[PDB]
Each structure stands twice: as C-alpha cells, then as structure tokens.
Coordinates of C-alpha atoms in Angstrom, one line a residue:
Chain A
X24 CA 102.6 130.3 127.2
X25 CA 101.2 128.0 124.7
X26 CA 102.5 124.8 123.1
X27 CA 103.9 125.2 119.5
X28 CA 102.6 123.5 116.5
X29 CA 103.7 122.8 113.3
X30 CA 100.7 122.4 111.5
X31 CA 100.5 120.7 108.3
X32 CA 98.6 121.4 105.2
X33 CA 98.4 119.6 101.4
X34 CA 98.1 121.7 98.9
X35 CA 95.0 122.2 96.5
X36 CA 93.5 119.7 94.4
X37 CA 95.5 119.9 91.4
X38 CA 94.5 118.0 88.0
X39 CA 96.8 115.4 87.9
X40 CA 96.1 114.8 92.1
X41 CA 92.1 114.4 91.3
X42 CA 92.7 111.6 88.8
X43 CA 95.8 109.8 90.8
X44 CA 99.1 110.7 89.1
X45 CA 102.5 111.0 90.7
X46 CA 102.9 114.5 91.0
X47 CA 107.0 115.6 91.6
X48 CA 108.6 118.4 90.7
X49 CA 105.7 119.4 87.5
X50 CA 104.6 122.6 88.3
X51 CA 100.8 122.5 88.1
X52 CA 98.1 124.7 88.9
X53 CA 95.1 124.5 91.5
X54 CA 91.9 123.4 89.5
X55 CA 89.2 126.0 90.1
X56 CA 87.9 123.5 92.3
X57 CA 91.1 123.6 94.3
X58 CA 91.0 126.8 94.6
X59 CA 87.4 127.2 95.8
X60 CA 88.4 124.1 98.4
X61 CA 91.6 126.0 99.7
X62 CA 89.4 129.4 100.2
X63 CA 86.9 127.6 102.4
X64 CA 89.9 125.5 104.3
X65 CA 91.5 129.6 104.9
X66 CA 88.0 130.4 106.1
X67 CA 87.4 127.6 108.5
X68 CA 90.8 127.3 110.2
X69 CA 90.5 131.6 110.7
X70 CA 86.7 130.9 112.1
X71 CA 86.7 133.2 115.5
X72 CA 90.7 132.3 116.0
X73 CA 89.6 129.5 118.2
X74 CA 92.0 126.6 116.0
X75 CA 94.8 129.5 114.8
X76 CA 95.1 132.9 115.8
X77 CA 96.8 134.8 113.3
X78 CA 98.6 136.4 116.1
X79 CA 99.9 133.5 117.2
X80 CA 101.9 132.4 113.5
X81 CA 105.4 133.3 113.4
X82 CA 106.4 131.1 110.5
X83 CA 104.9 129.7 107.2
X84 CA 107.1 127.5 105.1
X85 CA 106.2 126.5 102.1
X86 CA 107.6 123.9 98.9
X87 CA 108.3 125.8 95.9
X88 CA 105.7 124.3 94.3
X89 CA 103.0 126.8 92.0
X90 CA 100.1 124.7 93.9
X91 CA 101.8 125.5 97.2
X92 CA 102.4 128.3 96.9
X93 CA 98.9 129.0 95.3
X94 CA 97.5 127.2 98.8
X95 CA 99.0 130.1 101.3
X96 CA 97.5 132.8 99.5
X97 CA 94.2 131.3 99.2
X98 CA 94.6 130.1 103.0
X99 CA 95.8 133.3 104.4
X100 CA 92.7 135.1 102.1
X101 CA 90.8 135.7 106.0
X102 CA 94.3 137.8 107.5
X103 CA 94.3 142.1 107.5
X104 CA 97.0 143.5 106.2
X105 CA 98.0 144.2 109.7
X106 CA 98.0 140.1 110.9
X107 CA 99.8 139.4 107.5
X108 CA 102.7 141.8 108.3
X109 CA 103.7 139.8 111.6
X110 CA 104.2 136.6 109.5
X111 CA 107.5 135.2 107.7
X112 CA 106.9 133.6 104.7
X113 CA 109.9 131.3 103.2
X114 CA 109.8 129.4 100.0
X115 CA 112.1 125.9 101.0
X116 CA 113.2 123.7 98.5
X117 CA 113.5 121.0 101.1
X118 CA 110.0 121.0 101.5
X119 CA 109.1 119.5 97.3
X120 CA 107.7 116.6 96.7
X121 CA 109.3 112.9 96.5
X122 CA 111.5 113.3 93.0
X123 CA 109.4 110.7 91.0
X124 CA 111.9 110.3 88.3
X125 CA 110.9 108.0 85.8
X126 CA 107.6 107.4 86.9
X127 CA 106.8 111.6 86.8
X128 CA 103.0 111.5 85.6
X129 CA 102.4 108.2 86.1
X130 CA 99.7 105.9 88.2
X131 CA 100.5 103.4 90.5
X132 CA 99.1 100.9 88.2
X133 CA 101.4 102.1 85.2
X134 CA 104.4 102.0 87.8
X135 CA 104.1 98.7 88.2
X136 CA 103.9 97.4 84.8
X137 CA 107.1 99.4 83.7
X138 CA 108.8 97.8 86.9
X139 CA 107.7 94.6 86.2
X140 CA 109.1 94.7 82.6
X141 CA 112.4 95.9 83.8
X142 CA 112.7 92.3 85.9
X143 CA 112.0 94.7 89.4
X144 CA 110.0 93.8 92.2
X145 CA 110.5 89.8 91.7
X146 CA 110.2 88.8 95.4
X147 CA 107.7 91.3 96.7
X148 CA 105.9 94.6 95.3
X149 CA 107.1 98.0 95.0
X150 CA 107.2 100.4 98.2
X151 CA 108.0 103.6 97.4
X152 CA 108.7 104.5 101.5
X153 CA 111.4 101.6 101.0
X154 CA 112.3 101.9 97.2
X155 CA 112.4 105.2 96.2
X156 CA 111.8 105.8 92.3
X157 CA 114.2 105.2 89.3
X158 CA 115.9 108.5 88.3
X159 CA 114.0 110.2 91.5
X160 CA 114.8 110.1 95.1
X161 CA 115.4 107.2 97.8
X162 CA 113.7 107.1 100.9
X163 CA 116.9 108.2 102.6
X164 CA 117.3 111.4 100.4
X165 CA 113.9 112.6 101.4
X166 CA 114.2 111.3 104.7
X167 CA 117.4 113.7 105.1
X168 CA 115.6 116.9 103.2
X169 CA 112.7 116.7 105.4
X170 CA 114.7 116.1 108.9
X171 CA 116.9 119.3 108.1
X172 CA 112.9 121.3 107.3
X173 CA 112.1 120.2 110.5
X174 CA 114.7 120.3 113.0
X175 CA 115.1 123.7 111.8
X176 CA 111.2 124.3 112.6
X177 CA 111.5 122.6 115.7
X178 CA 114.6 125.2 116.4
X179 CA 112.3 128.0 116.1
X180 CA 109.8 126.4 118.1
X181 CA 112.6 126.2 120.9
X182 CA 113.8 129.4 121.2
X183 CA 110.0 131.3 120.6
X184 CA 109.3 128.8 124.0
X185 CA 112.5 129.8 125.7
X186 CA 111.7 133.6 124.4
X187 CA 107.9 133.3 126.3
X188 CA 106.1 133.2 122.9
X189 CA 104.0 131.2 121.9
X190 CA 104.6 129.5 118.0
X191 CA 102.4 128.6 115.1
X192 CA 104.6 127.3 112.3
X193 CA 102.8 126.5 109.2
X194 CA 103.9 124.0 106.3
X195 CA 102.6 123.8 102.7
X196 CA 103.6 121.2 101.1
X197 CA 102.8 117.6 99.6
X198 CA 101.2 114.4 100.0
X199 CA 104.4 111.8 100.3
X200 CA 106.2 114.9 101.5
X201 CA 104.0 115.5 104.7
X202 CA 102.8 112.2 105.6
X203 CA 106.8 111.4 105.8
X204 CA 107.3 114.8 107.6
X205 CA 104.8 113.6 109.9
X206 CA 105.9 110.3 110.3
X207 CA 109.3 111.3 111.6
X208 CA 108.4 114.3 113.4
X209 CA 107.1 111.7 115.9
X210 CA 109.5 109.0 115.8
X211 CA 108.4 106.6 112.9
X212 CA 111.3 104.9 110.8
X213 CA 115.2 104.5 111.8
X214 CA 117.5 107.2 112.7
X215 CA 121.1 107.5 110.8
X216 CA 124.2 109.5 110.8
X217 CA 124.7 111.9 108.6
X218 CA 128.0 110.0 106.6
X219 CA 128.4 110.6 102.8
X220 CA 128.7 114.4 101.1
X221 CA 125.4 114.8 100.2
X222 CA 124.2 114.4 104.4
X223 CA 126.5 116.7 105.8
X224 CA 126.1 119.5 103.1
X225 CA 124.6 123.4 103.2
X226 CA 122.5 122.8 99.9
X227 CA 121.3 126.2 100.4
X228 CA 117.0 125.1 99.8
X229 CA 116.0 128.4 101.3
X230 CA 116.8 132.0 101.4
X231 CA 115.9 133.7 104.1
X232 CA 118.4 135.0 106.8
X233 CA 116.0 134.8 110.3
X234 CA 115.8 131.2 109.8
X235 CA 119.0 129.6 111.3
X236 CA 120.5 126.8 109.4
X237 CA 120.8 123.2 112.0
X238 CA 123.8 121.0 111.1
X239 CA 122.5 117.6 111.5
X240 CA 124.3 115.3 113.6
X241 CA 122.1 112.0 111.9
X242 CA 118.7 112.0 110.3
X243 CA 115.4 110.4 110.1
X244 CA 113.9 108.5 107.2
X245 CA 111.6 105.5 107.0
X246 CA 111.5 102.1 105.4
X247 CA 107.9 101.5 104.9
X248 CA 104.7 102.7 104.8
X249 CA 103.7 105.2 108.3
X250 CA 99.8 104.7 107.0
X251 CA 98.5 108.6 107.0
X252 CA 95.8 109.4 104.4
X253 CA 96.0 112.8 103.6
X254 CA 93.8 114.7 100.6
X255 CA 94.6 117.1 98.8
X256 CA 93.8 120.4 101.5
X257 CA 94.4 117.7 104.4
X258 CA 95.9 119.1 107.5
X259 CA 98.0 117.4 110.2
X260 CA 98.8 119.0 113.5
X261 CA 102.3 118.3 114.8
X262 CA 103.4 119.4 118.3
X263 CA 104.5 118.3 121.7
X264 CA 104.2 116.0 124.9
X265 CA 104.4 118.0 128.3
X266 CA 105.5 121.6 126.5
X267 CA 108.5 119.9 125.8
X268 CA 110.0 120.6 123.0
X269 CA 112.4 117.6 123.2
X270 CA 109.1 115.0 123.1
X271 CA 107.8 115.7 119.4
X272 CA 104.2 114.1 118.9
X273 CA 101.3 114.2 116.7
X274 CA 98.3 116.0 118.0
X275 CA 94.9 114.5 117.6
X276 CA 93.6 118.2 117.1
X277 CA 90.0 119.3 118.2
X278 CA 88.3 122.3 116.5
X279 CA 90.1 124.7 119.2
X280 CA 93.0 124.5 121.5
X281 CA 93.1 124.7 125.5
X282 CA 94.5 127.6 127.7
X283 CA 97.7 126.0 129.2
X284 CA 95.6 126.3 132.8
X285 CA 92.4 124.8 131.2
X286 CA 95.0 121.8 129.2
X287 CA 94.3 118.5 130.3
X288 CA 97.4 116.5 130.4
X289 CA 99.4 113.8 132.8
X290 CA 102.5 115.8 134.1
X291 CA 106.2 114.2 132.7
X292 CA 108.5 111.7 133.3
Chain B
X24 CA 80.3 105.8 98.4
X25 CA 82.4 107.5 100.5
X26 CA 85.4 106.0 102.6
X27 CA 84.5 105.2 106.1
X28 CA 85.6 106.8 109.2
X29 CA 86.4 105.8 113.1
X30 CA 86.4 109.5 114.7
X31 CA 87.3 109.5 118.1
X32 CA 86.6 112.2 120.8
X33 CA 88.8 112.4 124.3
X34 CA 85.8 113.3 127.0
X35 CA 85.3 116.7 127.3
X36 CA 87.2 118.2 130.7
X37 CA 87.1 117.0 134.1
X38 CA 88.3 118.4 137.3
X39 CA 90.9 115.8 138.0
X40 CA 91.7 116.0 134.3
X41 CA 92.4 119.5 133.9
X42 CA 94.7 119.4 137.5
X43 CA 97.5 116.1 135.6
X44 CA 95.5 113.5 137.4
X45 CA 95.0 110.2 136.4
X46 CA 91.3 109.0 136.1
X47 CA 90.1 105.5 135.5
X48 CA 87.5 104.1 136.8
X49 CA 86.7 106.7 139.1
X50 CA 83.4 108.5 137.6
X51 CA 83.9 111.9 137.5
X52 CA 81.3 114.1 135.8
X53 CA 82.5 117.1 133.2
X54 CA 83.5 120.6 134.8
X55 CA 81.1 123.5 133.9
X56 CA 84.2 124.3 131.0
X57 CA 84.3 121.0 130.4
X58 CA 80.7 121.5 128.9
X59 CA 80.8 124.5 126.9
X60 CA 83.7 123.0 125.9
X61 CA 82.1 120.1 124.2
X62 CA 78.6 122.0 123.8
X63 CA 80.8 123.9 121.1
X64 CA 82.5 121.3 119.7
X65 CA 79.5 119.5 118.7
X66 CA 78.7 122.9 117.0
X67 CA 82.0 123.3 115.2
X68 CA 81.8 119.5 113.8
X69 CA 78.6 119.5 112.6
X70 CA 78.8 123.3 111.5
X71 CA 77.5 122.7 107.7
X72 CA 77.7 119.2 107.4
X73 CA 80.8 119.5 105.7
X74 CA 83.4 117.1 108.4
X75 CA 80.4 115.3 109.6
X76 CA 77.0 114.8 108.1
X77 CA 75.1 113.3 110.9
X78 CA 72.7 110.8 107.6
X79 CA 76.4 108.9 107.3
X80 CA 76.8 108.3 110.4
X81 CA 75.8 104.6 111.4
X82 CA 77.4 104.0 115.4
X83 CA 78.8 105.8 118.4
X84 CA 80.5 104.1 120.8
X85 CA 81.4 105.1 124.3
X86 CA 83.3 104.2 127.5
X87 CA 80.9 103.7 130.3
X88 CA 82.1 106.4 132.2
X89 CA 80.1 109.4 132.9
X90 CA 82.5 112.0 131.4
X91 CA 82.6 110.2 128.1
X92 CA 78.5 109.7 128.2
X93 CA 77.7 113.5 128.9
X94 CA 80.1 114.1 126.0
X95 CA 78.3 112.0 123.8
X96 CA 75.3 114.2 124.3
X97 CA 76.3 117.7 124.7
X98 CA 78.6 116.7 121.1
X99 CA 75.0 115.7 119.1
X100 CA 73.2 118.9 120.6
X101 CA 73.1 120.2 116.9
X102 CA 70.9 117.2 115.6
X103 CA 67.4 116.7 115.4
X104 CA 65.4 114.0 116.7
X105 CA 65.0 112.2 113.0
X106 CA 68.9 112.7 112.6
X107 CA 69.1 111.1 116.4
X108 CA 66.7 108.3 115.6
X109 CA 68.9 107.2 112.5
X110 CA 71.9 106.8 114.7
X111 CA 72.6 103.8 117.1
X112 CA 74.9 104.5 120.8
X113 CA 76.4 102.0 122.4
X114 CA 78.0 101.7 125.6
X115 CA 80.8 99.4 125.4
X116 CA 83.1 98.8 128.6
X117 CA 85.8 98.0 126.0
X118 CA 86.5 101.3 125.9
X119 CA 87.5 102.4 129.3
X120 CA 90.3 104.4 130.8
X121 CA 93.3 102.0 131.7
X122 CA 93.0 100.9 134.7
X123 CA 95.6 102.9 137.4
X124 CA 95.0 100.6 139.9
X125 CA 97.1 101.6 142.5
X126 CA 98.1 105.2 141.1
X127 CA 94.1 106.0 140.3
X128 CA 93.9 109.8 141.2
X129 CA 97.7 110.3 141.6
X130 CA 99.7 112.7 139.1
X131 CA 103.2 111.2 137.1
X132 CA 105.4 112.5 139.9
X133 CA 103.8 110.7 142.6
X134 CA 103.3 107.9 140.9
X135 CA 106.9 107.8 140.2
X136 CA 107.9 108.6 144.2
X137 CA 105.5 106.1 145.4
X138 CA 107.5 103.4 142.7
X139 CA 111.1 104.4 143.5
X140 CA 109.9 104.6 147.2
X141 CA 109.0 100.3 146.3
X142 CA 112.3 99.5 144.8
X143 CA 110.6 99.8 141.2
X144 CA 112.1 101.4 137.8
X145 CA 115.8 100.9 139.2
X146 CA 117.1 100.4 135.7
X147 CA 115.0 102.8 133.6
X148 CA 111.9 104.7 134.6
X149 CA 108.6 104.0 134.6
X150 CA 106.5 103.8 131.1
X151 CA 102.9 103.0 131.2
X152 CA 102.7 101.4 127.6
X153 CA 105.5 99.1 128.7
X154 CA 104.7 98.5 132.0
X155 CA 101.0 99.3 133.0
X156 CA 99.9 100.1 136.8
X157 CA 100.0 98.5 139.7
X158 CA 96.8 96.3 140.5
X159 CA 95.5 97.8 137.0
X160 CA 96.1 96.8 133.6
X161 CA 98.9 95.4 131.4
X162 CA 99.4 97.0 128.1
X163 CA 98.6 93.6 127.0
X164 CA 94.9 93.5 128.5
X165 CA 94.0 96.9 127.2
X166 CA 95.6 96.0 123.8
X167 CA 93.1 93.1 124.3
X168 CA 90.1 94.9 124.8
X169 CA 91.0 97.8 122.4
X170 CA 91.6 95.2 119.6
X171 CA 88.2 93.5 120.2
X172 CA 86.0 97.4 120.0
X173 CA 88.4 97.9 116.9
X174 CA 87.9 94.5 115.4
X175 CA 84.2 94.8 115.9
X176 CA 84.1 98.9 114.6
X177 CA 86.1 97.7 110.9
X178 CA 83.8 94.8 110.8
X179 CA 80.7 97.0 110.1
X180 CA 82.7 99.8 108.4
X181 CA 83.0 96.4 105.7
X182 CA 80.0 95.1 106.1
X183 CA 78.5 99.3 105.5
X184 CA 80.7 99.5 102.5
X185 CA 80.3 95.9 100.7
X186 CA 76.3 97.5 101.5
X187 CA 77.4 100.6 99.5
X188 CA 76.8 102.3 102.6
X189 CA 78.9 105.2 103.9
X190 CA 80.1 104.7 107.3
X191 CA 81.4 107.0 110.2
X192 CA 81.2 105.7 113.4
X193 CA 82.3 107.5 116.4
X194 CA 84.0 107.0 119.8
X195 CA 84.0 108.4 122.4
X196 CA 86.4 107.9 125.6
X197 CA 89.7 108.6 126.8
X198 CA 93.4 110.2 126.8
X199 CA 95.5 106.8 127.1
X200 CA 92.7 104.5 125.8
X201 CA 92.2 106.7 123.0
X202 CA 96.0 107.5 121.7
X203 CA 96.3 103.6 122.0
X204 CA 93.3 102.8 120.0
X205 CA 94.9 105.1 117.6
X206 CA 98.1 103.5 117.8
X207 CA 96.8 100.1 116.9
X208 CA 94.8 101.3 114.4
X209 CA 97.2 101.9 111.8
X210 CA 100.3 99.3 113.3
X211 CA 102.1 100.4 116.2
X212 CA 103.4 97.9 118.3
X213 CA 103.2 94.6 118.4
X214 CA 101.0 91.3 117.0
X215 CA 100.1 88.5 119.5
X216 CA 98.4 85.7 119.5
X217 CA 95.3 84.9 121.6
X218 CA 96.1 82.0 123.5
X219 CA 95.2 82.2 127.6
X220 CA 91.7 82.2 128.6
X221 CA 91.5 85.8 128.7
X222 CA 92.6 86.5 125.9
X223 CA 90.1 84.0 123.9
X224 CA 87.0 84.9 125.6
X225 CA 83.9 86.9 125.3
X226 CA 83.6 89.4 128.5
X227 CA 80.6 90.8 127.2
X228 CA 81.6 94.3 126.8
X229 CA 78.6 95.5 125.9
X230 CA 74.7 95.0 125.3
X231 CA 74.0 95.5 121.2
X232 CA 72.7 92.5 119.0
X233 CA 73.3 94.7 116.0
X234 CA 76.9 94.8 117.0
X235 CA 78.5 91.8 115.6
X236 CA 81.1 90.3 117.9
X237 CA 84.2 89.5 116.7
X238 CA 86.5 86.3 117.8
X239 CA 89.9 87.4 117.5
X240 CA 92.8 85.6 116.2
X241 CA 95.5 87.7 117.6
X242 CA 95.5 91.5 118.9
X243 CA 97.7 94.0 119.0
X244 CA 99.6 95.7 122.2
X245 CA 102.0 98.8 122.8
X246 CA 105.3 98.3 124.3
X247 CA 106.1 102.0 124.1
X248 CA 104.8 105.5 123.8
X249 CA 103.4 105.9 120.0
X250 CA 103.6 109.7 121.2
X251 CA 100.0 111.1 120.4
X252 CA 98.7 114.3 122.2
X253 CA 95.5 114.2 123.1
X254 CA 93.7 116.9 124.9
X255 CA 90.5 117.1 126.6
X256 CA 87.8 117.5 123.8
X257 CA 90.4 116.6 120.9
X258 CA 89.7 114.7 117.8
X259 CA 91.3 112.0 115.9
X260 CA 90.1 110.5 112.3
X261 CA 91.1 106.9 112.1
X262 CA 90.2 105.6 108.1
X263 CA 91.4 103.6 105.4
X264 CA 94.2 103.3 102.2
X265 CA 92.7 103.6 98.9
X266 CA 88.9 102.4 100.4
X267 CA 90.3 99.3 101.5
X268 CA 88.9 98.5 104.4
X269 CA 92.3 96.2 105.1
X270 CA 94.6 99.0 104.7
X271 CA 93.6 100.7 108.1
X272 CA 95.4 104.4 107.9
X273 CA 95.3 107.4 110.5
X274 CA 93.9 110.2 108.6
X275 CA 95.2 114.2 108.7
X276 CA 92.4 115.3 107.8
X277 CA 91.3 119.0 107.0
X278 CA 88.0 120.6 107.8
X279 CA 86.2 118.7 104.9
X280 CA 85.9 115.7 103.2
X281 CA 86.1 115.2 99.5
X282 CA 83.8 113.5 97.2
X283 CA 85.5 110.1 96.2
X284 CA 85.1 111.9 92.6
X285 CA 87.0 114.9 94.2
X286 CA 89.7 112.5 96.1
X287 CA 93.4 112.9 95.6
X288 CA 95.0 109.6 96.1
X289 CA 97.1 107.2 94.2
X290 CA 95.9 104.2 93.0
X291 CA 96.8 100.9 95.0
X292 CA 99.0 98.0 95.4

C-alpha cells in the first residue's frame, strides 16, 4: 500500500500576485497567463501518472477563493470523466488566505510606512508570522484554521491506510496559507491548547458530510518566519516518515514515487 | 536574472538502500532499477527546459561515492556535449553519507538491539541527529562539513548574481546528508561557533580552484529530526527570499519556474 500525501499547490498567478500585493479575502481572477501556467502545471503532474495517478486521489480541498478554485479545474483539465467521478471535491473556508485587514491590497513597502506612522514596530520590524495584520488575523487564528484543515486530512489519510488504500489528498490554496500549512504539518512553530471560544468551536468552514470533523485537543501555529518560497502554481508535497501516519514530514519529491518494495528508506524507531 | 537555485538529488537506488540498510562509506554501485530510475529522471527534469535549463546551470557537486557519481551521469544523459562543456562537476568529500561507524550496513532495529544490548539509550531512544554513531560522526562534524559545501555553494550563487548571472548549482548525494543540508539551509538547529582545531581548518574536501573556499565563522548542527523524507532519486530545491542571497529559503516548487517578471512574491523587509 502506498504512503499518503497531501500535496500542496498555490494557486494561479493572479494580477495583484504578479506585481506583489497582499492578496486576502479579494476575490480575483487568474490572469490569462495564470491560467495558461495552471493548464501546463495539470498537464505535467498527469504526465504518464508516474508523480499522481488520478486513481490514487481521494480528496481535493480547496480555499474558497475564485483563483482556487479556478486552479482545480485548470489542474484536473488531463482527468476523463470516469477518473473525475472517484474524486471529492470540498470547498473549505479554513483553507483562505491570511485575513490582511488593513493592509488588503497593499505592498510590503506600503505596510511598513502605515505601521511606522501609527508609532508600530519601534524596536524591531514587522513579522507578519509573529504580528498578524491590523483588522486581519493573528498568527494564532491562522495557526488554529489551518491545524483543524489538516488534522482533518491527516484523519483521512489514517483510516484510507488502515482501510488498505492508498491516499492522494490535494490542497489549493495560498501563499501565507500553505507555506504555514507546511510549516506545521512537520513540526515548525509551538504547539497550544485549544482555551478561549473561538479554539474549541465547530465554525462550520465546510460542507461536506464524508469528511469527519476532528475536535482539536491543542493546535499549531508559528512565531516567525518557516522560510518556504512558494510562486504562484508552486507545489509542496507533504507526507510521512516510515508509513506512519503519526510522523508527519515534508517530502523532498522527485518527478515519480517508488513502489513500497522498490522505497528506499531506514526502518523506524 | 533569475533567482538562484541549490537542487539536490538523493543517489539513485542501491541494493542496501532499497533493503532499510544504512550505507556510508561503503561504495555500493546503483541497482539495475536504480538506473532506469535515474536514466528517467534526468529525462523528466530536463524535459523542455522548463525546471532546469542546463545554459543556467553553473556547478554540480557530488559525494565521492560511486552511487552519487553514476547518478550524476545517467541524470545529464539529456545534454549535449556543448551544454556538458558549459557546466563544471565537482567531487567534494564534504558531501558524504554520515558516517555509521559501527552500525555501517545494519538496519534501525539492529542498530537499536546492538545499543540496548551496550547499556545505551536507557533514558530515551536512540536519535541519530542528536546523537550520531558509534565510531562515526557527531551531528556536530557533519553540521561542520555540510556548513562548509553550503557556505562555499551561496558564495558563488552571490558572486553569479552580483555578475547578473543566473545560478543553479546541483548536488548530488545522500538520504541523511542530504535532508540535513536541507535542514541547515533554511535554519534548523542550532548556531556554533568554530573554535577546536577541527572545526577551524581546511580538510581539503575537494580539488577545484574555481571553487572558492570559504573560512567559516560558525556553522550550523541538528540536534533533532527536521523530519524530511527523502527517497532514493528524490529532489529538493533549496533558494532564496525576495533574491536575497541572505535570506536562504527551502523552495516548494512546481514543475516550472517563473520569469522574475512573472514572479509572485511580496516585496521585502
């Protein structure tokens, strides 16, 4: 049986992306050549089935996001009708991008100038992974909406392994978004409990019945910077150590994945 | 110009690889899957020139050992001889394996006997990144040697760039030496400072005058698992924050790269 992934995918170059905005919860199109990018990302991860076999996805999450969304059609473009009916698609609100608030449209140059003349940032510069943004979201309220995303994906993942399946989740989403999804996924940042109202709550971000729900005991969510670049149609590929679902890690992905009995890995423990 | 790249490619299979085996220094050649294996990644990386156009590509480095070498060739079987002549290899002894010492050849479980069996790991078990092998290496002295290749690889990626030069320079070598490179690279674990005799000297490595050496200030070790996976014949992309060559930055990166025109990243600072 083969190891699940949880493989990770930016959306489509998007005009406020290309020229370095701070793109939230705006609802912008692909640019043409988005679109044309995202066609020939579907094509090349489809090639021959040697990096995703369409038999192989059971899930595809995606932000609500127009450009996300826009992303899985234009990815998926290579699947028959016949591959596309095996696959669950669900639109999850826990999935958007960091809530920039204030600074919605802005550059990172233009950030800090506002801050600066509102007497912020006086001992050291802006973070956004520590900060959050002013009438947007902290790091811990993105922390906590993306630790729900995944231990619900990593539920699946669990139970399509214990079921003899093998599982190919798939996650369109954002820049911030991702690299932090990322980030925690394998262990970056510091772990909380889940204390106040807001951390315990069922705020209902998706609607879809075959994907169960996972109370959170405590959370994940960073305080600096985890360092991923990711582009617009980047793709990350998230996993495990030792088919063990319990030891989440980041795969450094080749163009095609090994037959367990062909895998080349130390044994646990 | 385009931002530079450290790619890095685990050796293609090996028997003792493929069977949970650890292999350092012993020499083991590729398997006959191994080699297709590789033989068709070389073809999928350089399929169109659109992940990696062999004119940007300025160094490869490899590990001295065989498996890592017959990699190296059967990866650059799509180029021509002009597009080979362009390109500069170097062995670098840097980049070995860690050294299992007294577990070289073993798998975890016997490794983990054979320590129990010595009064070892009675408070917690066994971890390599903590606690290195048995008449092999520290973590510290392959966070040493690591340091030094990756010192020496960002050092030309600045000196390509400040040339207005596009730089991708890969590696090639193995599964713990590798997800540690990558661990360092963007700033797991910990700084230290050079101060033994080891840690100060130059063990000539390897045999390139165009390779600047680098005298290191301090380096960086693990002291735990940074929990990459890393198969045979898997791919990292190591890069850089907003083309800043001091903002060092793992990269998820998709099937092609984007003009810096094209880009979608925020601005800086």
């Amino acid at each position: 049986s083969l190891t699940p992934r949880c493989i990770i995918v930016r959306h489509g170059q998007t005009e406020w992306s290309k020229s370095g905005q701070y793109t939230g919860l705006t609802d912008l199109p692909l640019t043409p050549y988005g679109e044309g990018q995202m066609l020939r990302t579907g094509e090349s991860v489809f090639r021959n089935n040697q990096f995703l076999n369409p038999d192989n996805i059971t899930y595809i999450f995606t932000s609500p996001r127009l450009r996300a969304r826009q992303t899985v059609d234009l990815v998926l473009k290579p699947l028959s009708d016949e591959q596309r009916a095996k696959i669950r698609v669900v639109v999850d609100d826990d999935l958007r991008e960091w809530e920039y608030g204030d600074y919605e449209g802005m550059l990172t140059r233009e950030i800090i100038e506002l801050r600066k003349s509102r007497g912020l940032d006086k001992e050291r510069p802006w973070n956004i992974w520590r900060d959050g943004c002013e009438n947007g979201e902290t790091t811990q309220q993105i922390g906590l909406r993306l630790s729900r995303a995944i231990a619900r994906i990593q539920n699946l993942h669990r139970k399509h392994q214990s079921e003899g399946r093998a599982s190919d989740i798939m996650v369109f989403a954002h820049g911030h978004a991702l690299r932090y999804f990322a980030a925690i996924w394998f262990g970056l940042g510091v772990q909380k409990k889940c204390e106040t109202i807001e951390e315990i709550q069922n705020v209902k971000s998706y609607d879809d019945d075959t994907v169960p729900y996972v109370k959170l005991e405590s959370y994940r969510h960073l305080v600096d910077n985890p360092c991923f670049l990711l582009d617009a149609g980047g793709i990350g590929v998230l996993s495990y150590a030792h088919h063990n679902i319990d030891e989440p890690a980041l795969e450094l992905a080749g163009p095609f994945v090994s037959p367990p009995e062909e895998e080349s890995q130390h044994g646990d423990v």
